[PDB]
Amino acid sequence: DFQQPYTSFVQTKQNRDGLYALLRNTENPRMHFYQELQSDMYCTTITDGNSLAPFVNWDLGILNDHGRADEDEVSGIAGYYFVYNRLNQQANAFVNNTEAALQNQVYKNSTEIANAKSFLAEGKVLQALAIWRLMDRFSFHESVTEVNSGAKDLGVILLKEYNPGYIGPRATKAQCYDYILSRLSEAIEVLPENRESVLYVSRDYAYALRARIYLALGEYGKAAADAKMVVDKYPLIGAADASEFENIYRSDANNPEIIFRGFASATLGSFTATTLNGAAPAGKDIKYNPSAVPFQWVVDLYENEDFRKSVYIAKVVKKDKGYLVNKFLEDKAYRDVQDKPNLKVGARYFSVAEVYLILVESALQTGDTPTAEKYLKALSKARGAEVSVVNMEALQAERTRELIGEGSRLRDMVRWSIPNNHDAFETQPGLEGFANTTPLKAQAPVGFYAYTWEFPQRDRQTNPQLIKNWPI
Amino acid sequence: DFQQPYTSFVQTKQNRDGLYALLRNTENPRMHFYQELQSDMYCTTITDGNSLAPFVNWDLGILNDHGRADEDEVSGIAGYYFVYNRLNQQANAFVNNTEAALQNQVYKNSTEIANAKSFLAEGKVLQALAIWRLMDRFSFHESVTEVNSGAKDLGVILLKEYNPGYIGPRATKAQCYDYILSRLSEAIEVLPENRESVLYVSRDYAYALRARIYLALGEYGKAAADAKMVVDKYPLIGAADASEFENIYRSDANNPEIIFRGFASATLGSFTATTLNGAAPAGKDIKYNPSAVPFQWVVDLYENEDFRKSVYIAKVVKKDKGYLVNKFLEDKAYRDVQDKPNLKVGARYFSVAEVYLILVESALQTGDTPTAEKYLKALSKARGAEVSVVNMEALQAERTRELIGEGSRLRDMVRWSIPNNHDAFETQPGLEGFANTTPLKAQAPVGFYAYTWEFPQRDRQTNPQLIKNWPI
Ligand SMILES: O=C(CO)[C@@H](O)[C@@H](O)[C@H](O)COP(=O)(O)O
Ligand SMILES: O=P(O)(O)OC[C@@H]1C[C@@H](O)[C@H](O)O1
Ligand SMILES: OC[C@H]1O[C@@H](O)[C@H](O)C[C@@H]1O
């Protein structure tokens, strides 16, 4: 978007739809595969041509300046940083131009004014999401040890106006989190209690997003309170077997757990997300050749009865000798031909199973055992494998089982003081000669700085006020 | 204020009126502008000649020994400390002299004895107020981090006798709060249930004052119980628009929310309080040139429909370019000439909107959601902008909107674990080139010692038993 304030409701709504079209390609599963692969869950395969290995084996020399953000490619660490700043920039343009349009009294009636204020609240949630996704990967956790002098308590460059080419320093962690949380807070007051559409920002998604941020911050009482606002509003998938689970889970339209998602059809909004499964169409069947596969400990986390053991992960590597992360396989509603797989999925922004997990973790931390027991037993049972002992260990295992492929594990390891024990893990025995037994290039102990990414090299070169994260 | 006991009821009543005359110049809005400006709500303007900047930009070197308390000036931190210690001293003389008169049986009948005991109870409320106003600015909050060794659990010098030149150590926090609360408790038992006059200490003001102290201490159950005693006794201003709100609000005589205030007329009791609005008379016009203005986030707390957006703050900076705090503009009843502004206000000691806010916060803390919802919706609606979602964030916003200019925010930031994020805040865009973009001279994170003031330098030099607050 641009710098000219809006002159009509139609113009405002068109730019609002423009912002959701951008969100679909930003808050996308393809942007979270990098943080996913950097966790302690995967090993590379012989199919990997040093593409996923820098994240998997913690190759610090490559990760330092990883990715691209130019006219020909937007990928990796540099691509992630670019798309979330571009999302923040366009949400700024939308928010400021709607605020100006409201101040200039350009709307025709009270309905246009009320709806424009509501759109403005949706924009604020997207400003909070963009700045938080930058905080999540480019600001350090409190537990970090050695860091570049002055970076420990720094956030990100906090820019509130559509201003490309801006040269400024990083704001503090407190300043960035105060802005994220004030945005969500101001939005929750305007957005109606009941969700208008699964395709648009709602008060339900604002509570879910804030619950996620509070959990990440270790604010368990506040995470539990936000989680309780939406946890009972979305029912879990009701499935008698794995086949019924797959057909509902893989359906954007029919899955009752989705709170917010991006528009998708066979012609618009659909995209392949084959990084983790290395899947390709082969007539009416699907060929698999992954570049990274989970370790045996990840496979053994699931009971054979668990519906996610043939959906989230699938024994499809080399026909049937190993397991592959098949969460983003397809939504058959986005096929061009009914019987021909094209492996197209839609962008999902929040689902109730993540809210259940935020609630269980936060309840265990605040000593609310009945709440932890109710929601952990409910989620695991619906998945076909009920947990028998509800404790922090069972939450850690069920959270890992549920959010595999979604880039949660790297964050979870840091919050749970889990070092990367990659070198000690047993690879899948049926994948001998395919799965790599490559050791970490750099060890990742509790508090290691490289759990946080370095700011892209171009940005560090053009902005002398930007303080880098990594020492040495 | 002598050491000689009273010999008659007339003498007792004359000294009681002398104490209220002193209170007017002590518990005055001019003494609370310093703690107001030290909060996260203002930036300085180019009109500031380093007068308000030491508080706004946390210039510790100046704040350390700030103000004056001599025959020519009583101002700043040293002036605040002086005035409340003088109020405590004269309240002591009054209390001790009335107790002696009752013991010496100098009164004519049982009515004189009963009225003198009631006056004695009013004096006790004023001793509690003087010592609490000293605790509020010179004793540390429980959350404080590094301090001068031995200062963390100290109160203030607790002197109960009219004794000038007294050299003594600071009492503990427990000793000072036990004295504050025992004085209020003993007064509440004597003062009649129904207020005799808005101009004199009542049981209503003693409950409001104790509710304020309990909230400051985090004693939410006790604050809520004390607030419920008075919150329904004073109706809120009923106004159809901002003009009607302004005419009732600015009227000491006609505002139904005032529980206690000092006598004021054009010739006695009136005073200008132009620090925050930089207002000056110019014939029939009012010229504004403020030295500090709120940040844009403060202006944004208010909906355009909110009556406080043109009374508490008003868009009168550079004719109509920006907002200043206009709460203490004037009471037109204190004008010398009907059509000529002289900007004189009266000293207000408690209003029911503060009692509503104490109740809402305390209810949110004790899980009494119906009470929080009832009183937060009632106050915000009467102000022309009803809150739709009642939560902690709504209370913090509502309290900040309502108590702006009254020196509540510094205290509130500390109780709510809010650090000073001044450096990240956007200044009012129409005030570019007027509003200063100056960063804090010292950061103020959660628990920083400088949230509490240092004891005046002259007192630290003449009293070797006085332990200072600030480290380094
Ligand atoms: O303030 C009050 C009541 O709050 C009055 O009891 C007191 O101020 C008298 O007006 C004293 O009169 P003077 O000595 O001439 O100032
Ligand atoms: O998000 P902003 O910049 O408007 O900051 C508003 C916040 C809310 C308040 O608690 C803090 O002082 O600042
Ligand atoms: O004037 C509109 C404003 O309303 C307030 O209640 C919010 O804090 C921010 C918003 O910009």
Cα end-to-end span (Å), chain B:
39
User: Which amino acid is it at B329?
Assistant: L
CB contact under 8 A, A188 and B389: yes
Q: How much distance in Å is there from the Cα of B399 to the middle of ligand 3?
A: 15
Nearest to B298 by CA among B309, B310, B307: B309
B300 ligand 3 Cβ < 6 A: yes
Q: d(Cα B156, Cα B167) in Å, to the nearest integer?
A: 12
For chain A, how far is it from start to end, CA to CA, in angstroms?
A: 40
What chain B residue is nearest to A105 in terms of C-alpha separation? Answer: B304
Distance in angstroms (rounded) separating the CA atoms of residues B359 and B376: 9
Comparing CA positions, the residue from B225, B257, B234 lying closest to residue B365 is B225
For A189, the closest of B389, B418, B423 (CB atoms) is B389
Pinpoint the alpha helices (H) of A256-368: 296-299, 352-365
A399 neighbors A379 (Cβ within 8 angstroms):
no
The experimental technique behind this entry is: X-ray
Q: Which residue in B320, B389, B427 has the most chain A C-beta atoms within 10 A of its own C-beta, making it the best mutation to test that interface? A: B389
| Pick from A250, A180, A255, A187: nearest CA to A219 | A180
Query: A450 with A444: CB under 8 angstroms?
Result: yes
Q: Are B325 and B277 in contact (CB under 8 A)?
A: yes
Q: Which residues of B touch A189 (CB under 8 A)?
A: 387-389, 393-394
> Other CB atoms closer than 10 Å to residue A350's CB: what's the count?
24
| Helix (H) / strand (E) containing B430 | none
Q: Map residue A135 onto helix, strand or coil.
A: helix
Nearest to A174 among B389, B393, B419 (CB): B419
Q: Do B393 and A185 touch (CB under 8 A)?
A: yes
Spatial neighbors of B304 by CB under 8 A, at least 6 apart, are none
Contact B125, B201 (CB under 8 A): yes
Q: SS in 3 state form for B298-328?
A: HHCCCCCCCHHHHCCEEEEECCCCEEEECCC
Question: What is the Cα–Cα distance from A325 to A428, expressed in whole angstroms?
Answer: 13
Structure tokens at B188: 């509440």
| Other CB atoms within 10 Å distance of the CB of residue B114 | 11
Domain range holding A169?
Answer: 1-472
Across the interface, whether the CB atoms of B421 and A178 are under 8 A apart is answered yes
A178 reaches B (C-beta below 8 A): yes
The amino acid that residue B355 corresponds to is V
Distances (CA, A) of A394 to A218, A390, A407, A413: 19, 6, 19, 15
CA–CA separation, B283 and B339 (whole Å):
9
B297 touches chain A (CB under 8 A): yes
Mutate to test the interface with A, among B393, B446, B448 (most CBs of A within 10 A): B393
Q: Please judge whether B424 and A172 are an interchain contact, meaning their C-beta atoms are less than 8 angstroms apart.
A: yes
Instruction: Determine how many CB atoms are found less than 10 A away from the CB of residue A114.
Output: 12
Contact A175 B423 (CB under 8 A): yes
Contact between B419 and A171 using a beta-carbon 8 Å cutoff: no
Q: Could you tell me where the beta strands, DSSP code E, fall in A204-308?
A: 258-261, 271-272, 279-282, 285-288, 292-294
Quick check: B143 and B414 in contact, CB under 8 A? Answer: yes
A172 touches chain B (CB under 8 A): yes
A203: left (phi over 0), alpha (psi -120 to 50) or beta: alpha
Which residue has the least CA distance to atom 16 on ligand 1?
A: B21
What gap in Å lies between CA A399 and CA B288, rounded to an integer?
59
Cβ atoms A379, A387 nearer than 8 A: no
Do the Cβ atoms of B388 and A172 come within 8 Å? Answer: no
* CB-side neighbour CA atoms (13 Å) of A421: 10
DSSP letters for B233-295: TSPPP--SSHHHHHHHHT-TTT-TTEEEE---BTTTB-EE--TTT-EEEETTEEEE--SEEE-
Instruction: Give residue B397 CA to ligand 2 midpoint distance, Å.
Output: 10
Q: Kindly state whether B387 is in contact with chain A, defined as any CB-CB distance less than 8 angstroms.
A: yes
Of all helices (H) and strands (E), which one includes residue A325? strand A322-325
- What does DSSP say about strands B322-325 and A279-282: parallel, antiparallel, or unpaired? unpaired
**Side chain identity at residue A52, one-letter code:** L
Tokens of B451: 């949230």
Q: Could you count the other beta carbons within 10 Å of the beta carbon of residue B236?
A: 16
State this model's resolution in angstroms: 2.4
Q: Which amino acid is at A323?
A: Y
Helices (H), ranges, B64-141: 76-103, 110-138
CB contact A175 to B (< 8 Å): yes
Coarse DSSP helix, strand, coil percentages of chain B, rounded to the nearest 5 percent: 45, 10, 45
Cβ contact B116:B102 at 8 Å:
yes
Question: How many domains are contained in chain B?
Answer: 1
| Structure tokens given for A369 | 């055992």
CA distance B15 to B403: 33
**Which residue do the tokens 């090299």 mark?**
A457
Contact B371/B225 with Cβ under 8 angstroms? no
Per the CB < 8 A criterion, the answer to whether A157 and A175 are in contact is no
B172 phi, psi to nearest 5 deg: -75, 165
Structure tokens at A94: 């939308």
List, as ranges, residues 188-217 from A with C-beta within 8 Å of B. 188-190
Say yes or no: A99 contacts chain B, CB-CB below 8 A: no
User: Token digits for A317?
Assistant: 């590597």
How far is A262 from A348, CA to CA, in rounded Å? 6
